[PDB]
Amino acid sequence: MREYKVVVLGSGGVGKSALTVQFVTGTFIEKYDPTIEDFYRKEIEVDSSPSVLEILDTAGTEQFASMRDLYIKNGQGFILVYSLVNQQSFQDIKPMRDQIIRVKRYEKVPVILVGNKVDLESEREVSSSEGRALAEEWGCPFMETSAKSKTMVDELFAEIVRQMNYA
């Protein structure tokens, strides 16, 4: 079975857990402790070929540099999530990506940048153009999501599979 190990990263409260649980269960959650780590296995077809994803949902809030290193070493593809209604979470995702490239120095690293919470667009603090500009500097896909939408979340997880195969 081709298995892909995906790790979801980003500051506390951006929606890592809500995106993952939308993907797994098709439902949107209202809150969940930031100190929990959870693994999920889930089959997906991407471009009509069945794949198995193991997704690691991280306790991401200010966690110690060596603990982010451990997650990076053992993941194969990374979803980097910020909240478009929280510009500090956008500033925070830059160091996270650069740490991945350094830690994984002998590899091309499949990554996607996600600006989440697009359903709250009247509280938007980060423009689409600013996220797109950063993803263009990183040479990776960019998407704005809401964890309320199962189609957006399915498209996200399909595209990380495609990135992991192209690398």
Ligand SMILES: Nc1nc2c(ncn2[C@@H]2O[C@H](COP(=O)(O)OP(=O)(O)O)[C@@H](O)[C@H]2O)c(=O)[nH]1
């Ligand atoms: N409106 C809205 N709320 C969201 C969205 N994604 C997550 N949330 C809410 O934001 C809070 C934090 O989300 P959570 O997934 O726990 O964040 P994490 O700490 O990154 O895992 C919870 O109240 C979620 O319901 C989204 O796309 N839209």
Ligand SMILES: [Mg+2]
């Ligand atoms: Mg969480």
Ligand SMILES: [Mg+2]
């Ligand atoms: Mg658990």
